[PDB]
Design a binder for this molecule. Structure first.
Ligand SMILES: *C/C=C(C)/C=C/C=C(C)/C=C/C1=C(C)CCCC1(C)C
Length: 133
């Protein structure tokens, strides 16, 4: 299934610190960030996605259209410009963010009622698993 619609709650998070460090997120932010529960809310209609990740202190929101490149400013995540593209590889949603950082982007896919999110930057891979609310 490509259907990633829904409200998802984090259950797992391997190497979050290392991924944030790869983006040069400041020590004080990471120290608090590693403690927080995350909710991920996805609205998916055809190619049009609206993605919202929320926690007690910070959010990250992005809209995109599958198959359409977009010049993106990463806004308070890490304040960098990237050329972003989100496409399908089978039932895996693959984002590549071309810019300063190598191997930067993410992959989302569904297994049963769990959503898997691999976040990549440099040589760091962060793996998150969400369960559907
Ligand atoms: C497809 C799902 C994506 C692209 C989710 C991205 C999520 C983030 C960039 C999360 C960022 C953070 C928070 C929500 C608070 C904890 C600290 C951050 C900045 C890593």
């Amino acid at each position: 299934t490509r259907d990633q619609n829904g409200t998802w709650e984090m259950e797992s998070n391997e190497n979050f610190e290392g991924w944030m460090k790869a983006l040069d997120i400041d020590f004080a932010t990471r120290k608090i960030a590693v403690r927080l529960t995350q909710t991920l809310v996805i609205d998916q209609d055809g190619d049009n996605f609206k993605v919202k990740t929320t926690s007690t202190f910070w959010n990250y929101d992005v809209d995109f259209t599958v198959g359409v490149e977009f010049d993106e400013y990463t806004k308070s995540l890490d304040n960098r410009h990237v050329k972003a593209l989100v496409t399908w590889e089978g039932d895996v949603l693959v984002c590549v963010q071309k810019g300063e950082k190598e191997n930067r982007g993410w992959k989302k896919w569904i297994e049963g009622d769990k959503l898997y999110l691999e976040l990549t930057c440099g040589d760091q891979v962060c793996r998150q698993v969400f369960k559907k609310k």
